[PDB]
């Protein structure tokens, strides 16, 4: 019985690969070979946000693209006003080890999590005037590596226990558990329509998940190592992943295959953070070799470099309006680029 | 600038002061990463993620044990890694050696020293005195090995030599393993950790000052 099931699975995988190849007549490089090139882009450090005394791990922009949040190993979740570089809030954390943070779309809540296997959600808008903990989501049996807010009472968390979870902040229980990964889920990226999301795992696999149905729909492979960062395309019909194999990959939900590979023979270091511009023409690949790179999403060529970090770059985000880019790092300094 | 955008700066300065105070408080505590394996005795070395704090000689040490390819990079800045090993058995000893080799050659742990803790040496002594289980069966080089009961000392020295030989491979001197022997009823482990941490910090300062 087991042999028959294994043979059936192998045949299904072979047929899926054959179908994918049958849908691959041209290449994105050939399609955009006649497009106007981006050229030379030189973004400069407009702001430097000092104040962290440990390595920064996560950073999430606000919807208004003025506030932002960052988490550091010193037990500090700092909410900054990026315009004037004023620390709006500084939240002590129960666990000093935090690997993820999120900012609610309404701006009323923030989220954090890490090696404590607890997703702490803090309510910013309170009568008491201080940032208290609104909820402590528990149930994961591994460290949380990424979390994203859907609404004020719905958050998707990815943990190291090979499972993602759509929660219910009002009741604090997992409304849906997304299973199917064989390794730690490093990152998750919600889609603009908020009906689907993606999750990259250590098995070099990016799985698309339907929030409403609560079941995986598509699986993308093609990476040689762990997938550290993943980000949805602004259109919602594509996404990009960064992996430890020093390559970035572009996948299409409809095409269900790898379109473009952004990599260079010179670079040998893994990607830790990936984010998209508002128009999608620029892919911001954050590396751990102390600098970030800008890739032409349609030419698969490097557009510019963002250097100025003395340590590993951990988190990278783009403002919702596309005004600026925040890049955190392990040297406790997160910079803003424009 | 107006009052609204200046009281904000005053609040930012207050937050900066609090952050500096907290960081100065945190810099005075040494963070230890407690590693090991199941049934290795890591539970009783010193009398989600689990954290413990103990003070000796007015110095506070924090030991964190999690229960490792990915999250280990979160402990890139720990002062030392307390690697506990149960030497009583021999079948799993090679597994412990492989774990130690993986930890030593980790990309994010190339500048951290390891306070190796060969735990449950009393059971090793009992096993080698009984003679029912022979190390030579598991390690063929043990028969050709001799010390630099005397058999217990030879076995202990062999285990330490194997661990140190694993450590010295491509070490480059940036970090050095510090072997130790600890029994179940031992109570001097805190002092050993204290001395090892003192040596680690002294070596780090000497490296910083461009000396040896």
């Amino acid at each position: 019985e087991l042999d028959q099931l294994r043979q059936e699975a192998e045949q299904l995988k072979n047929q899926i690969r054959d179908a994918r190849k049958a849908c691959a007549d041209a290449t994105l490089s050939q399609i955009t070979n006649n497009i106007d090139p981006v050229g030379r882009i030189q973004m400069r450090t407009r702001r430097t946000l000092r104040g962290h005394l440990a390595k920064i791990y996560a950073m999430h922009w606000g919807t208004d693209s003025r506030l932002l949040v960052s988490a550091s190993q010193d037990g500090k979740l700092i909410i900054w006003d990026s315009y004037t570089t004023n620390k709006v809030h500084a939240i002590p954390l129960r666990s000093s080890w935090v690997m993820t943070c999120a900012y609610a779309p309404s701006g009323n809540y923030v989220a954090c999590g890490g090696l404590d296997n607890i997703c702490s959600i803090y309510n910013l808008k309170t009568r008491e005037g201080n940032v208290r903990v609104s909820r402590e989501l528990a149930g994961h049996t591994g460290y949380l590596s990424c979390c994203r807010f859907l609404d004020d009472n719905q958050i998707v968390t990815s943990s190291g226990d090979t499972t993602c979870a759509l929660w219910d902040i009002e009741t604090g229980q997992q409304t849906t558990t997304f299973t199917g990964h064989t390794g730690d889920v490093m990152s998750l990226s919600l889609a603009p329509d908020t009906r689907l999301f993606v999750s990259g795992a250590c098995d070099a696999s990016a799985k698309l998940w339907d929030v409403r149905e609560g079941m995986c729909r598509q699986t993308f492979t093609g990476h040689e190592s762990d997938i550290n960062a993943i980000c949805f395309f602004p259109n919602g019909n594509a996404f990009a992943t960064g992996s430890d194999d020093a390559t970035c990959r572009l996948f299409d939900l409809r095409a269900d295959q790898e379109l473009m590979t952004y990599s260079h023979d010179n670079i040998i270091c893994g990607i830790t953070s990936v984010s998209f511009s508002k128009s999608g023409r620029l892919l911001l690949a954050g590396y751990d070799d102390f600098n970030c790179n800008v890739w032409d999403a349609l030419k698969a060529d490097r557009a510019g470099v963002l250097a100025g970090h003395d340590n590993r770059v951990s988190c990278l985000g783009v403002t919702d309006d596309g005004m600026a880019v925040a890049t955190g790092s392990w040297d406790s300094f997160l910079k803003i680029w424009n | 600038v107006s009052a609204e955008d200046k009281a904000a700066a005053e609040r930012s300065k207050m937050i900066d002061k609090n952050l500096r105070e907290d960081g100065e408080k945190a810099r005075r505590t040494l963070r230890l990463l407690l590693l090991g394996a199941d049934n290795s005795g890591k539970s009783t070395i010193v009398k989600g993620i689990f954290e413990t704090k103990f003070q000796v000689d007015k110095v506070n040490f924090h030991m964190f044990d999690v229960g490792r390819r990915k999250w280990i990079q979160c402990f890139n800045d720990v002062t030392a890694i307390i690697f506990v090993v149960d030497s009583s058995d021999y079948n799993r000893l090679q597994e412990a050696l492989n774990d130690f080799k993986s930890i030593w050659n980790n990309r994010w742990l190339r500048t951290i020293s390891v306070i190796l803790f060969l735990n449950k040496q009393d059971l090793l002594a009992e096993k080698v005195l009984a003679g029912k289980s022979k190390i030579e069966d598991y390690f063929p080089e043990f028969a050709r090995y001799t010390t630099p009961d005397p058999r217990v000392t030879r076995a202990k020295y062999f285990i330490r030599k194997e661990f140190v030989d694993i450590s010295t491979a491509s070490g480059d001197g940036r970090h050095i393993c510090y072997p130790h022997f600890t029994c179940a009823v031992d109570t001097e482990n805190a002092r050993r950790i204290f001395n090892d941490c003192k040596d680690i910090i002294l070596q780090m300062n000497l490296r910083e000052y461009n000396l040896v």
Partner: single-chain antibody, 232 residues
Framework: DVQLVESGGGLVQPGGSRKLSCSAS????????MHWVRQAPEKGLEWVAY????????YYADTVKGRFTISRDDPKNTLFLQMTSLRSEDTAMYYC??????????????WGQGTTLTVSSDIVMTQATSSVPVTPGESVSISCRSS???????????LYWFLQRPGQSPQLLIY???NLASGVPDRFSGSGSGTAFTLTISRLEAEDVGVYYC?????????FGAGTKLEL
């Protein structure tokens, strides 16, 4: 939850001394800027003093500068106003007002109780209307004018609207001329440009009758307008 109580007041002979206390409970008093704002028995509200978080910045009104001292005890969660040489024009009802300042904050959100005290250039805000008789359910408007433009170079127009019901302490309605304070019904709205602002309410309900004050916060002092009045 949030509650500020006041102690002191009473009768003071002219030129005397008095210590007014404001005890906070239910919120982080250390991180909230505090103000003392006085209201005359038959006039508008007058700003008296302001102290920042941690006592790092203190401002006084020109009327009471040099004669009034403001202080705060964070461990005891107390706000102190020491008044010396009380003139006959300093008799008023004093309110200690919380106000926190960060991007998106709502200053003057919660006003404490009142303490009566009976003694035996500046941007001036104009409230042309003195009393507007209105009927419930009818949308009305209140007009306010400023001597100088309140629109700042950052796009933030520091105008605040406060409501005082008969026998009740003031509360914040609209802060920064466009945003609505929390807990206030969505009927209220604010609009206008520099030196010309309008607070428009739709479907006026019961208990909405009272005094309305337009305050500027561009710089100091904090000059309240004369304030209009809505009555049945």
């Amino acid at each position: 939850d949030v509650q500020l109580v006041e102690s002191g007041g009473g009768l003071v002979q002219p030129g005397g001394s008095r210590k007014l206390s404001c005890s906070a409970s239910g919120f982080a008093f250390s991180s909230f800027g505090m103000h003392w704002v006085r209201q005359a028995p038959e006039k508008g509200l007058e700003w008296v003093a302001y102290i920042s978080s941690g006592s790092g910045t203190i401002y006084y009104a020109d009327t009471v500068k040099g004669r009034f001292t403001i202080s705060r005890d964070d461990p005891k969660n107390t706000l102190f106003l020491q008044m010396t040489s009380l003139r006959s024009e300093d008799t008023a009802m004093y309110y200690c007002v919380r106000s926190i300042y960060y991007y998106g904050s709502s200053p003057f959100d919660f006003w404490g109780q009142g303490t009566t005290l009976t003694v035996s250039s500046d941007i001036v805000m104009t409230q042309a209307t003195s009393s507007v008789p209105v009927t419930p359910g009818e949308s009305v408007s209140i007009s306010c004018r400023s001597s100088k433009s309140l629109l700042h170079s950052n796009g933030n127009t520091y105008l605040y609207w406060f409501l005082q019901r008969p026998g009740q302490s003031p509360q914040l309605l609209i802060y920064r001329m466009s945003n609505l304070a929390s807990g206030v019904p969505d009927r209220f709205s604010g609009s206008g440009s520099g030196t010309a602002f309008t607070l428009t309410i739709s479907r006026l309900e019961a208990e909405d009758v009272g005094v309305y004050y337009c305050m500027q916060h561009l710089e100091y002092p904090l000059t309240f307008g004369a304030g209009t009045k809505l009555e049945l």
